Structure formats: structure tokens, C-alpha cells
Subunit: 244 residues, 4 copies
């Protein structure tokens, strides 16, 4: 009864806000240069991944648990959500990321705060190289999300939340060495806003993840497992007036 | 057939006593300053999470496997358990934590004993900051618990025990840096009793987790996925006389 | 058609032999003092656990996947298997552990070989203190096994293999500091035969685990979730003549 | 309508190529000597394993998700796939490994490139010893794979993808110390071609993994769980003309 005007839509947008707040808080907080014991690569990798896995499990049934502007955009291109759901989700994700980083800023002691765990290019490498890396990291993540959340799947699914979570961990085990690992425009945007700190190569953390995810969406939803759908039904999905 | 008098209820209370004993024993025992090899952050975090994850799987069918007064009180507020089940569970949890911490004291060598892994603030974290952190830590946990044990769930659940387990691990990966990570007033209370060691900040490890869990319950059960029910049925739940 | 004469029984005894060989090989192999990169506590605990988890998944459907004399004896006392099945399994497990430890001895370089990762009591720990620890370590494991493999379970079980595996990992995260972590008489026995090195505290690695596992069986099968059966039926299980 | 010619087959070959590309990229990428933070044993092992778990979850429904010439050949021997499928999968796997290694070479900084994480025999290990290790490592993996993907299984399977994945992690926790851990001829071939360097022991990374997986297939499909097909049916599978 009008997609945008429903209580379900209000709960979904709020859930996207809340999930991204919690994600960023946990992600950045585990990555700070704590004097007591500097976090290791695997430590940070599992922290980010377990945050997504926990949040996917907890708030996934409310909104779909995107928690990531690149994932949301790819689902739009692959014809899975409406334009307006995409807009509100992305908006909620960026606001959530800012809040999460802001809350972290207010609780972290001064010796730990540092750069608030912003993404940083590895200066032994170039923009183009780093962007290719982020394209790959987000590509495998996206592909795993689409495969784990496809209601058509007949292969035993296991735990979608834990599979998706551990894909985030995988991305970090390589990506940290290149860019601090983004895979998520909101993860990069949040702390950059709170610390008023945008590096020249900030575009990498938007273009890489988005292109990676969208490529996975094209591959998955259009080449590997296409669906039925008339053109008018495809237009209806974009508008949010599709009756299945 | 009169809740408090049933064999089921007796087993439930025993299981909450036993689960907290084993949890606290393993948790604290993994976190001591073993001179042979000092436990790392990730190592401690996984021990706490796998303990909860193993105990959820093993004893959860008996009692619901709360293993945590903050969670028990949250489920009361959310109208899921009776007042008497709450009192007995909390009592069983506190006594169990003391038993586990006591058993550890009796087995651990002198060079490893230390302060028996009591909770303690970072020397640069204030009580106010610690408070907000514990709230967030227990909030994500409670939310993951309620989502993973909801009978109404249609989303593939995966493993609720391991999801809840890894959500605890998630908590520790940030929490240890602030308060040694509590998320659980019984976990804080057990070693504090055995060592007769209550820091001024001890209240944080009670209020922080309880408020965090209660907010998650209010959100989950009254805002996101309400049950409705008549006000006489709600009262019947509190008094232990509700029939489905 | 006669238990010991069935093809299924032969496959089962072989499976227990093979699983224990592979388990002990991976277990000990991961724990050698490799000079290029000394294995960390978490490294070893995960290896042991992932070994059991992988072998439960792969060979459990053939034999039950005990891979542990303590578990087998516990299932005998809990009236789940026959006496003759118990005898052959233990035999196969002990022989398997010698094979695995022997094979590792054959491939490992001497700069890493050391004691072939035999169990050893911590200097600062009495035999009796190690006794209580080994009891508890094996107790939580057995309890998790019985809960995860119970065909009466209505609770989402998730992955019994991974849950059981991670329980082994949990055991090592504390137990390594006390005894190198046994939980398994065959695991202690294997390298001790190959190295011809039996420590004074060797009985601990038998009594601790066996007592811990048996207590868990009594608790689970006779107190928490019993099955009321006639005396003659119980005797029929022991003799291997029972028909459900 | 002729196996090789179908749309499904074309996708399956591509999926194997893409899976091996991504696998090798992440695997080698996680293993480079990054001077800022040298990857730990457990760090590398989880990267490799989680790569397989993620790719098995994502692309397994498309191809069977072999990502490994040893597994593919084992499945041919075990009468599970056609000769033509085995040929194209192996070919696609090897081309994918080169592509993945090639892409890493293009993005990795000079200070971390090193040997591009080619497998390398331990100086203190003989070729014959490394041979036995690789046999055992791939044996346990193949066994886990066949048990987890058997549609005749009644025991709860849990997460096939993650069980297989963590089996790979298990392989590495022992294998890295001997050979850098191969378990997969493509994984060894890829960077060897790109770097134009083949070790004297390179055959071990082929023969070891292939023998181990084939033995596992003979044990699983002909000794433990046979299917009793007629000889004409077996020949039909080999030719890809089998109808169930
Ligand atoms: C690092 C450790 C990773 C541990 C991964 C645990 C894998 C989880 C894992 O193994 O989950 C397996 C799920 C599969 O679902 P199902 O069909 O068995 O249950 C019915 C199902 N449709 C439902 O109702 O949800 O098991 C649920 O209990």
C-alpha cells in the first residue's frame, strides 16, 4: 500500500541506519592503535567480518541487511530493489556511518583515537592498483551475498550471515595491506566526515567497491542466474509497484 | 503444572547454574597472564565466544541458555519470561559465576593467578565512556540473541549458538580495550567476589550491560517484531500462568 | 544380522582407526616447535578443533565419529552403544593414534620434532589440579557432543561437526597451559608410545578425560534427557541385540 | 543435448576459471612478505580456507565448485563426472591460476612481491617426505568434500561451504611448514608460470595432491558408500550421456 509510506519501509530504513552505526563503531574501534596492545591483521579482519555476520543475522530480516552503499547500488542495477529503497538505504547508511564514527570519537581515549581508523592508501602502491584491488574484494563479497540470499537456491545454504561475514574477513586479510580495506563507501565516508579528513585518493573507496559490486550483480542476476520478468515488471520493480 | 514446582523448572535453574560456572571458568582461565605465553586479544575473545557458543548448543535446550543476568532481565522486560524464572535464573547465574571463578582459583598456578581476570577500566577510559561502550556491546549481543531464537523467524537461521557465540567474540574484540569486556554482570561479579576485589567502576559492569540488553529488548519485542497479546495474557506471562 | 559380523561394523571400526590417525597427525603436527614460526596458542587450538570438525563431517556418518576413548566409554555408560562396539572402537582409536604419531615422526624434521608434542604437566601444577582441569575440559566437550547428535533435538542444531570442533578448540584455549590439553586418552597415548616417553602424570590423561566424559553422559542421558526403557532392553543394547 | 554444447556447461567452465582466479589472487596475496606486518601462519591459513568457503558458497551451484585439478580428477576416478568435464575444468583451473597470479603481480608493490608465494620445499624436508604430507593434506580435504556434497546424506550437513573451507585452513596449519602447502596443483602452477620459476620439487605439488584425492575418492565412492550402477551406466557417466 505505497512502498515508501509503509511501516515496513520505515523499519527497514531505520535498520539500515542502525546496522551501519553499529558496524562502523565496531569496525573502527577494533582497528585503533591501542597502546595496550596493537591490533593484528587477523584481529581486525575478524572484527569487521563478525560485525557484518552478527548484524546480518540480527537486522537482516528487517531490511535485507545491506549495510553498504555499493551492495545496495548493485541490487538496484540487478533489478532487485526500487530506486527509492536504494536512495533511502544509501542515505541511512551514510548517516549511520557518521553517527557510528562520531560515537566512537566520543568514547575512545586520546592515545587510541589517532586518525579514527580512516582508509589510507599504501604509498608503496598506486591509485589504479588499489582500485583494482577494491574492485576484486567487493566483487567476491557481492557474489557471496547474492548467492546466499537467492530464494531459488537448492544447494544447502548453511548460514548466510556467517558466510557473508567471513567473506568480509577474507577481503580484509588482503585489502588491509592496500587501502586499509574499504569494500564499503560508508565505512570510508563516516570517519572521514567526523575527522574532517579526505585523502586525495578517497575516490578509490567509492569507485572500486561500487564497480566491483555492480559487476558481480550483472554477472549473477543477468548472465549466470537470470530471472523471468517482462519489461513492464522490471519497470514496476524500479518504481516499487511490482506484485509478485 | 505450577511453574516453580515442575521438574523442568528445576533442570532449567541447574543448567543456568552449570552454564555460568563453566563459562566463567573458561573465560577467566583463558585470560590470565600465563607466563609461558601471554594470551592475545583475539585468543581471549574467541575463548569467551566459543564458551558461550558451546554452552548455548549444549544447555540451551534445557533453560534457554541465558548464562547472563543482563539477558535474563531483558527477556523479562520484553515480556518473554516470568518474574520468578528471572529471579531464580539471576540467582543461579551469580552463584554459578562464583563457583567457576572459585574452581579456577583452586587449580591455577600462583604465577598465573594474578587478579583472576576481573574486569578493569583502561587507565585513560572514564566511567562515563566505559558505560556507553558496555551498553553498545551488550546491545548488539542481546539483539543477535533475540533474532536468533525467535520462533517466528522465516529467514534461514544457520547456527544460532555459533552466531551468538561469535557475537560475544565481537564484543571482546573492542570491549577488552575499554573494560576488559563485561557484557555480563555475572562475569564481572564472580571473580570480584572470589578475589574480594571491587574497583570503584564496578557499577559500570552492572548498569552498562543491563541497560544495553533492556534497550535491545524494547526495540526487538515492542518496536520491530511485536506480539500484541491481551493485557491479561501479558500479566499471565509475568506471573507464570500463561498458556499458548 | 549380528553386530560384529556386519559390513557396517567393519567400516565403522576402520573409520575410527582412520579418523584418529588423521586427527593425531594434524593435532601434533601443528604443535611442534617449528623454529621458523613457533605455533601460537590459538593456532594450535584451532588446528585440533578444525581437525575434529572436519573428521566428524567426513567420517561421523560411518561410525558416529568418536575418535576418543573417553567419548566411547561415556556412550557405553550412557547406554547408547554395545560393549563390543566400545571395545573395538577404543582398540582402533589407540592403534590409530600410534599410526598418526608414527607417521608424523616419519615426515617431521628434527629441528621441529622435539618431544612429538606429548602431553606434559606444567611444573607449577600438581597432578590433582590437572585432574580437575582435564575432567572439566572433557566434560563440556562430551556434553556438546551428546546434545548435537541427539535425534530427539527440536532446537536448530546448525552444524554438529563445527560446534563439536570448536568445543575442542575451546578446551585447548585453557587446557594447553595446564597439561598441553588432552581431553583424549588416545591423543596422549599415541605420541607416548612412539617416543617411548611416559611421564609420571600419564594416568591423569586417562582418568581426567574418562571421568569427565562419563559424568557428562550420566547427567545428559540419565538426569536431563533420559529414555525410559525396560531392564531387558538396556541389557540388549549392551549385548548388541537391541532392535528399536 | 550433448554435454559440452549446453549453456549450463559453458557457465560451469567459466565459473571454475573465475573461482580459481579469485582463489589464487586472495591466497597468494595474503601470503606475501608484507614488511609492515608479516602475515602469520594462522593469518595465511584462514585467508586460503575462507577463500574456498566463500567461492564454494558463491560459485559452487554453477559448476560443483572444484577450484582444484586434484579434486576434479578424483571425481572422475570416482565415476562422478564425465571425461570432457574433467578436461575443461582442469584447463580452466590452470588458466585461472595463471590469471590470478598475473593480476596480483600487477598490483603488488615491489617490497612485498618476493617470489609471489610460490610453493617451496623446506630445506630440512626430503621430496618423499613432502610427498606423503601433501597426500595426507589433500586426502582429508577430498574426503570432507565428498561427504559434504553427497546428496544421499541424512546426517545434518550444516554448512558444506564452510566445512570444506575450514578443511583447507586445517591443511595449511600443518602444510605451510613443509611445502608452503599446495593441496592444489593449480595453486602451485599459477605463480610458477608467472614468475617463470619451477622448483626441483614441483612434481610433488602435482603427484602428492592428486594421489591423496584419488585415494580418498576410491575409499569414499567404492569402499564406504558405493552406488551399485551397472557397467553401461558407468561408461555413460564417463561419456556424459548418463540419464537419471
Ligand atoms: C568460524 C566458524 C563458522 C561456523 C559456521 C556455522 C555454520 C552454520 C550451519 O551449519 O547452519 C546449517 C543450517 C542449515 O539449515 P537446515 O536446513 O539444517 O535447517 C532449517 C533451515 N532452513 C532453517 O530453518 O533455518 O542448520 C540449521 O540448524
Amino acid at each position: 500500500k505505497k512502498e515508501v509510506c509503509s511501516v515496513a519501509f520505515l523499519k527497514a530504513v531505520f535498520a539500515e541506519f542502525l546496522a551501519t552505526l553499529i558496524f562502523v563503531f565496531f569496525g573502527l574501534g577494533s582497528a585503533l592503535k591501542w597502546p595496550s596492545a596493537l591490533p593484528t591483521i587477523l584481529q581486525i579482519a575478524l572484527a569487521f567480518g563478525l560485525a557484518i555476520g552478527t548484524l546480518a543475522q540480527a537486522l537482516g530480516p528487517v531490511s535485507g541487511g545491506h549495510i553498504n552503499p555499493a551492495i545496495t547500488l548493485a541490487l538496484l542495477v540487478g533489478n532487485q530493489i526500487s530506486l527509492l529503497r536504494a536512495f533511502f538505504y544509501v542515505a541511512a547508511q551514510l548517516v549511520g556511518a557518521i553517527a557510528g564514527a562520531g560515537i566512537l570519537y566520543g568514547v575512545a581515549p586520546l592515545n587510541a583515537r589517532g586518525n579514527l581508523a580512516v582508509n589510507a592508501l599504501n604509498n608503496n602502491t598506486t591509485q589504479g592498483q588499489a582500485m583494482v584491488v577494491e574492485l576484486i574484494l567487493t566483487f567476491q563479497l557481492a557474489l557471496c551475498i547474492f548467492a546466499s540470499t537467492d530464494s531459488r537456491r537448492t544447494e544447502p545454504v548453511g548460514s548466510p550471515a556467517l558466510s557473508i561475514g567471513l567473506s568480509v574477513t577474507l577481503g580484509h586479510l588482503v585489502g588491509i595491506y592496500f587501502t586499509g580495506c574499504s569494500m564499503n563507501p560508508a565505512r570510508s565516508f563516516g570517519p572521514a566526515v567526523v575527522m574532517n579528513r579526505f585523502s586525495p585518493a578517497h575516490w578509490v573507496f567509492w569507485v572500486g567497491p561500487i564497480v566491483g559490486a555492480v559487476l558481480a550483480a550483472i554477472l549473477y542476476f543477468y548472465l549466470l542466474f537470470p530471472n523471468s520478468l517482462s519489461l513492464s515488471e522490471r519497470v514496476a520493480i524500479i518504481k516499487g509497484t511490482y506484485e509478485p
